[PDB]
């Protein structure tokens, strides 16, 4: 169709307006004293939330260019959230600060490419300094303590997370499930997780969680790409008459098969989720065989000559529960007898010692580790439905935060890690004066989030920023208690991964938008 | 879809306008001298009502932001009504007062978070003082007296309520049914009540009552989640052939099963209501088995192997009458042989003495109490059918008021409890000047409802408010008789729970709205 | 101590004043913030952060203040920044008088456009 | 009356628009290949001119704020022209460049005060560099060469200027008059020049030169400030009866006397020019006594006793010709016995002998030098009257240029002195980054005039600017011949005073606009 094209200053002004709207919408929900945003719903009861993720998801502007700016900032912020589990609001406010200052500099006649170079240099230095400033969270005590912080200062969640990581390992798989009794239950089941996600968002059983969840589903193990529904239609009918959901994993699902499966998911006659097989090639085939061994099913391979049409219910894999997210798929408690898994891991180990290349050996190490480690299941127990659901949500959030912490440690939260990093990097310089301007822009932008937090608190932003800059280490201004001190001791912690990802994604999107010259959108 | 976003002062002004419209619509219907509001209907006959609940339910504005403000106040007022059975008008007028004064202070530059702290601190102090000021309502004479007041000064209704409470207990289940003869009849039948509600509002048989009511319905008892209708086409068709209503309770009903049941209800071919099972896990299964013992049916348990496909009409439980409300579900006179009930309660009792933990013993004691107490059915009768229906409605509302009274006592009605509480709390202070201003806002807000009542009476509001403030205890102003006195003796009562819930919900919504900075809604 | 620091010092030492009515207390707070204002305006003209400089001058004592020309603190008397006490007193008193007259103003009468 | 007030960015934008209009109007007439601008006249015949002075004098915009910007740039450019005799266009284009870049930087958020400081620092360093790069114009050969260059490469004018300067001295007074014969005549007459000028432009006899010229006028000498017309009314009547012009010099002329004299000049009945007395205090009285000795008149001193009523035509001083300009007043060939002049100069020499302080000695030395030096009169002759007038104008222009040259030497003209100086100063730095930005702004603005000249020539500005920057000394680009070389050798000479004054005045006005924040103008 006919397109509308904006060039140079006008395009950047429109992006600035859109980003300003989105960032003003999401920034008020930042900090312990964060305000709340009223979101309309078609049902009639407005939703009052302090969560910046929902506010960002709701935002969409009428103007097409402003919509572009808001949508791209939203996309990078959501990428930050997916990578880290938090920091969407921080990423968005950082992006707004960088974009505002960089576009002001560009309108001043600076060179946009040199500004982007300076921004990237400052952000790389900031990431290195944050890695320096992070304190490790490897011990069980620190794991439990950060878990307690993440779950709104609840020690039970922290001790559960610490026990789970002690049982399975900090690299192990931990999943939260509903617990029948009042007491919490932790156990190790046979399962595995891989990085493949659902093929279509319409498979999502729980939109609030944003992930596909199935109870006692059937596993389909195919070595060929699925394109025609007729190939597996008898298997689909057998699953439907069985009454249990079906999970299909293969090389790929495309075309009319995917379309009809998605249509069935809207219809609800048969609940089937489509996930690609992990990896590619011989490694993909090997991992499919491992999944078949785990679930007790059999893989459908073309080279064997056996086909999908003759496949029946008994040939399918079965598991107690599976969780599929857009970034990963988790298989929990597949029905596979222990001796089969023991023989599988034993032959994997013998393949390990007979192998020579380091890359293959490492890949087979991680394969056997994810096969034999299993999945630790945390059964959240409570007395009431609402309190049980709230506790489960808190446990999930704390699990994400603690995973980030054990990955990369924890820095001083509350937006003071960035202010400390900017204070220590204030001496950085670039090749060109424009690069120096970009570096200064990045430093001021990293200043911004703490200023926003203390503005939400109602206190003076500049005074608090100066006071925190004067200090050193983890010294900072606790927003909740309105008093300065050591952030680590006061319990205001942010995982290093969260802050690092927020800063990096905000910098990337801000550089992309600063170096933007033209737009192409549909006409109004 | 494109969204319209307001920030700061504009958003709060729009919310203030919407709340002002809703509160002006519902406030004139407050007090004995309350005016009436004409609500249009599509049929052609306008409805003249003095009930604030209907006026609130009918209010919906064209401006999206004003609509969201009005809808938030409506939702919290409805929550107050559900919790207490009255006070929707009081909750709405209190919310309007707090919101107006708090937004004026915010526009003055006051800190919104500190204002909210002052508001909810003053409200907590007010709740404590109200608990101090309440008089007990445990004795049968006081129960009858408050019931008489509730039913427009009718001693027969109070006598019936007092007799029912004596027969079953203040914690027992009491239900009102139409009486065949003129004389009112009370009897105790085997039944039990749980807090689960209907899954969809489309199940409501009587919209005026707002609850699902069935006559001699069939009870379905499943330990599995209900998603597929194909599991229970046979029993549904058998019930349809029998022609009796069907009530289904299981872990959950959703998806195509829920859709087709709602379709059947809207078509009217089969009357089926869907209600979840109480509790979760082992206690949920035990309560489902208790309901099976009560109704004489059998629980479709997956671990047993029994399936809904092979379920027969004799397997379904049967009850004389069931009432389903969004807050709770009541089973009345379930047809099941008594010796099963005594055996089940003896089994629960022996479980009690073999039980050890306090939590399990308390849960088992509650279960056995609700199983053995039964349901006391009040068969209200009259000479004429129309006056019999009117008397049934009066008995229902008096029963709700008396349940609230026996829950938390009663205070002086007519809006003088709040003015007395404000008079005694006038010396409260907060940490900051902003908290003090919030406390003053809350106190003036608690003053407001009596002013509105005496304004509807046409008398001067300030003079009456000052005169009531000068007094003490339950001394107040009677709106009907236009002369002061002891409101407890003069028959102007309000249950303590009603006033407490109204104040708390108004405070919560006003705090949410005062600290609101951003509003997101669809474009016009 | 000229340069607008006499008023901020006076406000710092008067921060504990109280009145009979709460509105009187609010009016006193208004007067104190207004007394803070001129130094903030000067340091805004200088391009420096107003709140930080105002806080730093408040934390000091005596004639210690901030010099606009040299952009650094110190004793304002010895740094050559002098304002006669009559000038500051008259400015404050006349500003207070006009602000009181306008705050308590309810009606204005003017010719038509 | 009512005023329109603009604050901050919009006011500066209005300045930028007005300055852009004026600078684009005058900047096309820059360089040998300069275009011409058509100026409307009420008479009907438009004026086509390549002179930036007239174009600037004609510019006046309709928007009041843009009018302010244009008018103040015009005023500073006129001051530069008055001080140096040339450089209005260069000053205006430099001011436009500085203002544009400075306003862009201010919009970038740089501190305007720091930008002004950096601009002033760069301009001071540039004045030092210009002094370093200037070559002296002391020798008579260089004086003749500069005079020849100024008068469109005419050897005769340069020779006349050089020989007149050798005859009377570089500090001496040289005046150009119409020549009776074909040959050019130079003679030295007794006269002096002081820096006082006419009170109001309404005294201007010839608007083309902007100066008052009188043929054989009468001189009035009063030691009192003239305020009442009736005091000198008999003198005015006697002058009008005589029919010759009158020149009045006293402490000041104000009030009704000034009004009547202006009215008489406008009507033309009496042609009298009013000039203030030179100096102040006893110095003023001594200078009036010197004037009386020179012109043979008598000083009307109140303390001595004579009154302006008693003054007669014989007491009035008489001169052959006088020229009055707003910068200075010249008395040429005042009639008076040489014996009186010799006695007066001997008196001044004996005050030299008796004087002690260096200041008084220097002042008396200046007085005796300017009294005994006389006035050199250049009588320009030609074949016809019109070319005689053209030659007289060229001679006057060359005289001004040569006076500037002997004052401060000459530099490489054609706008390459500024680019050379900027190349030298490219390593300058300031205390703050904003000062560095101001310095860079000044340097690029210094580049600007050469770019404008070579753009008028049709060549690429950037390539020529880079080529000139690559060279050194007086190496540059000749605009007329479109080929590089040495400005001094090719005769493209600009007096150092002209470039210095243009640069300084442009810097001053640009700083004034950069530090401008508010405006007050009458409403449209």
Swiss-Prot record, chains A, B, D:
Subcellular location, record wording: Cytoplasm
Name of one Pfam family that matches: Cpn60_TCP1
Enzyme class: isomerase
EC number: 5.6.1.7
Keywords: Acetylation, ATP-binding, Chaperone, Cytoplasm, Isomerase, Nucleotide-binding
Binding site for ATP: 29-32, 50, 86-90, 414, 478-480, 494
Notes on how activity is controlled: During the substrate-folding cycle, the two GroEL rings separate for effective substrate binding and chaperonin activity. Ring separation is triggered by ATP binding to the trans ring of the asymmetric GroEL:GroES complex and avoids formation of functionally impaired symmetric GroEL:GroES2 complexes. Activity of the GroEL-GroES chaperonin complex requires Mg-ATP. UMPylation of the chaperone by SelO/YdiU negatively regulates its activity, and may facilitate survival under stress conditions.
Swiss-Prot/TrEMBL GO biological process terms: chaperone cofactor-dependent protein refolding; protein folding; protein refolding; response to heat; response to radiation; virion assembly
Effect of residue 397 to A: Can bind ATP with normal affinity, but is defective in ATPase activity. Binds non-native rhodanese, but cannot release the protein
Organism domain of life: Bacteria
Family: Belongs to the chaperonin (HSP60) family.
Protein name: Chaperonin GroEL
From Swiss-Prot, chain C:
The species this protein was found in: Escherichia coli (strain K12)
Subunit-level organization: Forms a cylinder of 14 subunits composed of two heptameric rings stacked back-to-back. Interacts with the co-chaperonin GroES. Can form asymmetrical complexes, composed of one GroEL and one GroES, and symmetrical complexes, formed between one GroEL and two GroES oligomers. The asymmetrical complex is the functional unit. It was suggested that the symmetric heterooligomer may represent a transient intermediate in the chaperonin protein folding cycle.
Functional summary from the UniProt entry: Together with its co-chaperonin GroES, plays an essential role in assisting protein folding. The GroEL-GroES system forms a nano-cage that allows encapsulation of the non-native substrate proteins and provides a physical environment optimized to promote and accelerate protein folding, probably by preventing aggregation and by entropically destabilizing folding intermediates.
Positions that bind ATP: 3, 67-69, 83
Impact after mutating residue 49 to K: Temperature-sensitive lethal mutant. At nonpermissive temperature, the rate of general translation is reduced and a defined group of cytoplasmic proteins are translated but fail to reach native form
Compartment(s): Cytoplasm
Family: Belongs to the chaperonin (HSP60) family.
Protein name listed in UniProt: Chaperonin GroEL
PTMs per UniProt: Phosphorylated reversibly during heat shock.
């Amino acid at each position: 169709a006919a397109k509308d094209v904006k060039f140079g200053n006008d395009a950047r002004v429109k992006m600035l307006r859109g980003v300003n709207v989105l960032a003003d919408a999401v920034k008020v929900t930042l900090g312990p004293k964060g305000r709340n945003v009223v979101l309309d719903k078609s049902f009639g009861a407005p939703t009052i939330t302090k969560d910046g993720v929902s506010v960002a998801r709701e935002i969409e502007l009428e103007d097409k260019f402003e919509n572009m700016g808001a949508q791209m900032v939203k996309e990078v912020a959501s990428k930050a959230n997916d990578a880290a589990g938090d920091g969407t609001t921080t990423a968005t406010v950082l992006a707004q600060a960088i974009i505002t200052e960089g576009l002001k500099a560009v309108a001043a006649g600076m060179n946009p490419m040199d500004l982007k170079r300076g921004i990237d240099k400052a952000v790389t230095a900031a990431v290195e300094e944050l890695k320096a400033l992070s304190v490790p969270c490897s011990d069980s005590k620190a794991i439990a303590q950060v878990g307690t912080i993440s779950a709104n200062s609840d020690e039970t969640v922290g001790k559960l997370i610490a026990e789970a990581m002690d049982k399975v390992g900090k690299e192990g798989v931990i999943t939260v499930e509903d617990g029948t009794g009042l007491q919490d239950e932790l156990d190790v089941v046979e399962g595995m997780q891989f990085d493949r996600g659902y093929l279509s968002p319409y498979f999502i059983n729980k939109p609030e969680t944003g992930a596909v969840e199935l109870e006692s589903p059937f596993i389909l193990l195919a070595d060929k790409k699925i394109s025609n529904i007729r190939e597996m239609l008898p298997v689909l009918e057998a699953v439907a008459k069985a009454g249990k959901p079906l999970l299909i994993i293969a090389e790929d699902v495309e075309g009319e098969a995917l379309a009809t499966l998605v249509v069935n998911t809207m219809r609800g006659i048969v609940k089937v989720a489509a996930v690609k097989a992990p990896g590619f090639g011989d490694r993909r085939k090997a991992m499919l065989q491992d999944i078949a061994t785990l679930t007790g099913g059999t893989v459908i391979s073309e080279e064997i000559g056996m086909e999908l049409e003759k496949a029946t219910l008994e040939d399918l894999g079965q598991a107690k529960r599976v969780v599929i997210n857009k970034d990963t798929t988790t298989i929990i408690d597949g029905v596979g007898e222990e001796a089969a898994i023991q023989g599988r891991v034993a032959q994997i180990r013998q393949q390990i010692e007979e192998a020579t290349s380091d890359y293959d050996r490492e890949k087979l190490q991680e394969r056997v580790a994810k096969l034999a480690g299993g999945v630790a299941v945390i059964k959240v127990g409570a007395a009431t439905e609402v309190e049980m659901k709230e506790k489960k949500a808190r446990v999930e959030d704390a699990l994400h935060a603690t995973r980030a912490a054990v990955e990369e440690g924890v820095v001083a939260g509350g937006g003071v890690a960035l202010i400390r990093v900017a204070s220590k990097l204030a001496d950085l310089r670039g090749q060109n004066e424009d690069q120096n301007v970009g570096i200064k822009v990045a430093l001021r932008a990293m200043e911004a989030p703490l200023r926003q937090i203390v503005l939400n608190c109602g206190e003076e932003p500049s005074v608090v920023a100066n006071t925190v800059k004067g200090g050193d280490g983890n010294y900072g201004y606790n927003a909740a208690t309105e008093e300065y001190g050591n952030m680590i001791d006061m319990g205001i912690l942010d995982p290093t991964k969260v802050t690092r990802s927020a800063l990096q994604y905000a910098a990337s999107v801000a550089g992309l938008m600063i170096t933007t010259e033209c737009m192409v959108t549909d006409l109004p």
